[PDB]
Amino acid sequence: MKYMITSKGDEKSDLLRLNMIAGFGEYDMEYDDVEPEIVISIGGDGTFLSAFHQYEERLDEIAFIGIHTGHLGFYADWRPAEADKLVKLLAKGEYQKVSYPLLKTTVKYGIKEATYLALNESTVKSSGGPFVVDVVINDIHFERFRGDGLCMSTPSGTTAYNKSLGGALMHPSIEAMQLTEMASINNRVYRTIGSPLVFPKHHVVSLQPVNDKDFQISVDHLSILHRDVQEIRYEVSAKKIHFARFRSFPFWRRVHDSFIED
Amino acid sequence: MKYMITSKGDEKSDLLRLNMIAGFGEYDMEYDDVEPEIVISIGGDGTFLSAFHQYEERLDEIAFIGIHTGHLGFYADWRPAEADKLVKLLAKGEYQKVSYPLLKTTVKYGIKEATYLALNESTVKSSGGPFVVDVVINDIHFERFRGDGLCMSTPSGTTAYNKSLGGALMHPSIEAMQLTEMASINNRVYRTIGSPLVFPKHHVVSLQPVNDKDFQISVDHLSILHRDVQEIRYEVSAKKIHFARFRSFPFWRRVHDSFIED
Amino acid sequence: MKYMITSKGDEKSDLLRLNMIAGFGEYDMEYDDVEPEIVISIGGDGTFLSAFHQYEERLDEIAFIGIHTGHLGFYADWRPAEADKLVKLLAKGEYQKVSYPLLKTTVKYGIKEATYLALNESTVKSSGGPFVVDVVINDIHFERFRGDGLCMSTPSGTTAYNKSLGGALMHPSIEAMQLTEMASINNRVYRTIGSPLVFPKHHVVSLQPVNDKDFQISVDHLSILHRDVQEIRYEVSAKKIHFARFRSFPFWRRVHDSFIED
Amino acid sequence: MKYMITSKGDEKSDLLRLNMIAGFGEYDMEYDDVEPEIVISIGGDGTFLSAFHQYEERLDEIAFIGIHTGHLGFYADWRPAEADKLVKLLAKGEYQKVSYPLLKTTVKYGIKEATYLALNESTVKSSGGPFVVDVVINDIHFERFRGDGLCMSTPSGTTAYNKSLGGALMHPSIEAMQLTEMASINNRVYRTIGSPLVFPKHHVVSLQPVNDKDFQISVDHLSILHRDVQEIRYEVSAKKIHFARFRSFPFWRRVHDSFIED
Ligand SMILES: C#CCCCN(CC#Cc1nc2c(N)ncnc2n1[C@@H]1O[C@H](CNC(=O)CCCN)[C@@H](O)[C@H]1O)C[C@H]1O[C@@H](n2cnc3c(N)ncnc32)[C@H](O)[C@@H]1O
Ligand SMILES: C#CCCCN(CC#Cc1nc2c(N)ncnc2n1[C@@H]1O[C@H](CNC(=O)CCCN)[C@@H](O)[C@H]1O)C[C@H]1O[C@@H](n2cnc3c(N)ncnc32)[C@H](O)[C@@H]1O
Numbered sequence A, B, C, D: 001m002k003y004m005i006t007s008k009g010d011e012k013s014d015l016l017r018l019n020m021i022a023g024f025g026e027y028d029m030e031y032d033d034v035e036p037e038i039v040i041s042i043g044g045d046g047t048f049l050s051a052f053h054q055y056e057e058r059l060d061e062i063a064f065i066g067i068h069t070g071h072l073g074f075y076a077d078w079r080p081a082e083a084d085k086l087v088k089l090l091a092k093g094e095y096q097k098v099s100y101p102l103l104k105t106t107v108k109y110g111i112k113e114a115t116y117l118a119l120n121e122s123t124v125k126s127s128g129g130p131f132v133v134d135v136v137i138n139d140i141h142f143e144r145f146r147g148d149g150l151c152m153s154t155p156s157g158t159t160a161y162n163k164s165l166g167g168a169l170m171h172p173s174i175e176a177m178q179l180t181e182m183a184s185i186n187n188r189v190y191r192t193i194g195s196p197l198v199f200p201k202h203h204v205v206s207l208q209p210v211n212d213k214d215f216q217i218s219v220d221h222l223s224i225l226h227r228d229v230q231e232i233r234y235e236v237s238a239k240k241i242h243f244a245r246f247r248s249f250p251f252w253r254r255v256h257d258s259f260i261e262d
């Protein structure tokens, strides 16, 4: 049906995009980047993340496909050599759709609210000075965190920043989010859990300022300075990202290919 | 209905057990340690684990309750001072039952099979020499693990051995198991994922010997030498342990009380 | 001889400072904050670090003493209740001087040089985007580091930021520096050593930009944005900080009191 | 002068050994495996460790050389293709000798003493049940360790078991030993330092039993069950292993070749 193609913007990806558009012109496929049903991302995971956020208002009407022109991007299913096969299989449809969970971040201020959706993770750090927040889980005070910051990851995000922080890798069929620490301070007077925490759907993790109320909050690639923050709330989103699958590429094989050998 | 009480066996726990039996004698409660419906464990988590394995054939007919006579045992909900309140609330029933997931371990041999159920975890180490196994996830070869051993944990087990190995803490409403490494070797020629792995229901993790076929396999407290092993299979059990709850004691508050402060 | 006293600046520390000056007025002690021989720091480790950097040009003519008015500051040897004993013992001198190693950081630019001395550590992060540096040890290319940043610690600094990053704790009689990673990326294409690295005197660790040349460099509490950086060089300083000791307080007991129990 | 050659024992190493003996027969070199001055090890690091322990009584009269017939063994300096060059350079002598520190382990019993020398590390675990020891540093009680065990490493050993336990890598010019934890238990009631600890020469680390007095103690490859143990003492040895060097192969380049790329 309606489709669009985003490109990393180097010569290789731009030309691949033009060739796929040319191939799509031989089928009942309309190029439409306002209301597409298929969104093809040609580049790396950064490119794929930008495509996700470009259309995060129509996630229920869109199936995503990634082509990796560099190395194996984690959200990519195809090499550039298979683009013609992809054009052909996509045009005839009848594919499988799989869905990964997403993370909802709510930022509340004094004398307002903003919500963000993350495919990989949302992190919080301070605006320069020391980072201290109270961690509140389903309204019970769990810990006072002192350190560099905190990272809340989706399942598919667990192989990204979460992994570098010592977090566990979670299969994306698990509707959950995972909280990892960035360089926590632990001594006689300061104490955190240390371990990563995995939360199910409907659990709410709230960060509440102790002194400083300015924070640098990242959502996937995007990092914003937020001022006069009263609370940051994390929960598994009700929204999901949908992928168009045309063949078996299991998550654990994807992990193996990216970290063990390929 | 029918109940029984296990004791750690020190004077404190034995006397508490006798007093609870005396109190139960004032209600329509029959002591029966062959087919109980309530199993009370008075002691620590070691005592509770022994009670679980004492009745792992009737897990669907039993609700467990733990009283901690030492520190806060993780599976314990009551201090000894509340035993009389527990006797009274139990006798009148109408309580809530909550269920935690369990781990199934299957051990196959050459020229046979044995299955085990774990509330905390199942671990594998070698019989002395080097430990090398191929890790196979849903029939795809994921990695060749070299090191001290491997640990597969239930959700409620994530706060136990799993935590000491760097694993994530998982809420027990998540039907999953978590695989953590014990001192993996990683250099130019040997490579493991490093990170803990969290698997959903119906995923099968199989360990297959490379050279030596003798392994020391632990299931909760119980450790056995297994010889001529062809495979060790891990999967989330279809069976669940049921707890009798009489008041709110959230898992994350339980974690806070055990590791942060109480 | 000549002495001065720095205060954290709260009422408790200011009054303690005034009382010690009054007590010192009964001995042959001159208050001189231009060329002191004893520098007393009343506050926490932040206060002590500021005193160190206030006089880092006269480190060979100064013995430092710390009084902790909050909790046990790691560089502190005295509680406020012993200030009168300290005044008396200091006035009569004949004490022991012990010396801890320091870290030298050299920052080179295009179309210039700046050097800094650290008592705790020096860290490097990027100016916002991705952090990528080549790590060069004694002129051999060791690794290309991708991640959040890097931390180079002194021995006495190993209990500070270094500890939160998984670094080892080193006794300060060892003339060394320790390099720890902040959230390194490790996959099929990107590879770091992972482990902390401990370097002896005369080894030089050089960080060289790969793309972006702007970095945020911290030295103890002080963090500066450096632009147009060609190289960051780390080596154990030839300079040392000298402490006035009046009684045994072993480093490992200091570690025990701060992290295990007191 | 006098030399001997140990072989891994496969065909490749045995034949290389015979060829080197044949080449040595053309110089003033005598084969003597009772009082050699050069000890050549042909195999892996396991082979080299056995050669070290074969002659640990004459460490001051011996310079070691390793040839790796498998991958790059860490104590190996030569590939088999350079054996003829090695024979020639060795025969004419005038080489450089470098020395690495060693670890002394003393095991005391009730109603006796045994000492062991380690090139890599010495570890302690329990005889099956729980492992609990009091850690005493220079006669001050530092911590009560509960967990799987403890590992004390030499500098050159830091790239071996120590690395897999999260320990730091230390340059061998530093006369030190490093203590790392194996799966320590840390909760409200049990507390260890967590971090690796690096000790200088003359510091003594003593492990003292709390309940069970039987331990499995490993020294490099060799693991023995020790019964009725009163104390295990660790200190940097006064003895050193000497290597014959014929060219520059820096330790950090050795680390790079083994863990980053070669
Ligand atoms: C940074 C940056 C600039 C690029 C934008 N990227 C895109 C991505 C991605 C992504 N999602 C996943 C995933 N789902 N599974 C597995 N792998 C994944 N990746 C891969 O990780 C790398 C990300 N970029 C870099 O490391 C920058 C290179 C420095 N020369 C690339 O190789 C991706 O192919 C944003 C993502 O960055 C992640 N990120 C940030 N800081 C770190 C860090 N310290 N360690 C590890 N990841 C980190 C974070 O989660 C964010 O969303
Ligand atoms: C060992 C042993 C002998 C005692 C038998 N225990 C009973 C239990 C338990 C248990 N389940 C949980 C849980 N669900 N949540 C949170 N906490 C939990 N615990 C608590 O952990 C301790 C277990 N025992 C010891 O550490 C022995 C003491 C040494 N002086 C106790 O404090 C328990 O109150 C068996 C369990 O041992 C665990 N275990 C074994 N080795 C380690 C290790 N190295 N680190 C951490 N745990 C370890 C493992 O998972 C096993 O099932």
Ligand SMILES: C#CCCCN(CC#Cc1nc2c(N)ncnc2n1[C@@H]1O[C@H](CNC(=O)CCCN)[C@@H](O)[C@H]1O)C[C@H]1O[C@@H](n2cnc3c(N)ncnc32)[C@H](O)[C@@H]1O
Pocket: A130, A131, A132, A146, A147, A148, A182, A183, A184, A185, C044, C045, C046, C049, C072, C073, C074, C120, C121, C156, C157, C158, C159, C160, C161, C162, C164, C220, C221
């Ligand atoms: C930050 C900050 C503001 C305060 C300035 N401080 C002073 C100090 C110190 C210091 N030197 C040592 C030492 N030698 N031994 C053992 N302990 C030590 N400390 C103690 O660590 C804490 C430092 N400050 C904080 O954590 C801020 C509180 C947040 N509400 C205090 O308790 C000190 O009593 C500067 C030092 O910060 C260290 N620092 C920074 N970020 C982290 C982090 N993520 N984790 C751990 N330490 C960190 C770093 O190395 C720097 O030099």
Ligand SMILES: C#CCCCN(CC#Cc1nc2c(N)ncnc2n1[C@@H]1O[C@H](CNC(=O)CCCN)[C@@H](O)[C@H]1O)C[C@H]1O[C@@H](n2cnc3c(N)ncnc32)[C@H](O)[C@@H]1O
Pocket: B130, B131, B132, B146, B147, B148, B182, B183, B184, B185, D044, D045, D046, D049, D072, D073, D074, D120, D121, D156, D157, D158, D159, D160, D161, D162, D164, D220, D221
């Ligand atoms: C085990 C075993 C049987 C072999 C005997 N080896 C010889 C050696 C060595 C050695 N010294 C160093 C060093 N100095 N620098 C860097 N690398 C080094 N190595 C290398 O590490 C490996 C050791 N063997 C194995 O891993 C067995 C293979 C399993 N299929 C080999 O690749 C060596 O080329 C004894 C040494 O084992 C080390 N060891 C034991 N358990 C672990 C573990 N869990 N993780 C990491 N190392 C471990 C320990 O320190 C001991 O001394």
